């Protein structure tokens, strides 16, 4: 794996998150669509660090 994000990798993460956030497996759809190898837990932490979600439970809303 890698653990840092280039500017373009961050923008890609955001586009995929925006698309898949209402699915039942947002992280799975993100991971299927990025080329870099990354762990699920690190991607979750990056979504939090960017403020795309404010806390973990927002990744799976009712």
**Cα–Cα distance between 4 and 21 in angstroms, integer?**
22
Taking the alpha carbons at both ends of the chain, their separation in whole angstroms is 32
Resolution in A, one decimal? 1.1
**Cα–Cα distance between 32 and 19 in angstroms, integer?**
13
CA dihedral 33, 5, 49, 17 (to 10 degrees): -20
**Cα–Cα distance between 23 and 61 in angstroms, integer?**
10
**Cα–Cα distance between 55 and 23 in angstroms, integer?**
18
What is the experimental method? Answer: X-ray
DSSP code of residue 62:
-
Residue 16: partners with Cβ closer than 8 Å, 6 or more residues away: 29, 30, 33, 34
* DSSP states along 5-53: --HHHHHHHHHHHHHHTTSS-HHHHHHHT-SS---HHHHHHHHHHTTSS
All structural domains of the chain with their residue ranges: 7-59
DSSP code of residue 60:
S
**Cα–Cα distance between 1 and 58 in angstroms, integer?**
25
């Amino acid at each position: 794996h890698i653990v840092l994000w280039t500017g373009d990798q961050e923008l890609e993460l955001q586009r995929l998150f925006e698309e898949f956030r209402d699915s039942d497996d947002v992280l799975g759809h993100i991971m299927k669509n990025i080329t870099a190898k990354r762990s699920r837990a690190r991607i979750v932490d990056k979504l939090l660090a960017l403020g795309l979600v404010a806390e973990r439970r927002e990744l799976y809303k009712k």
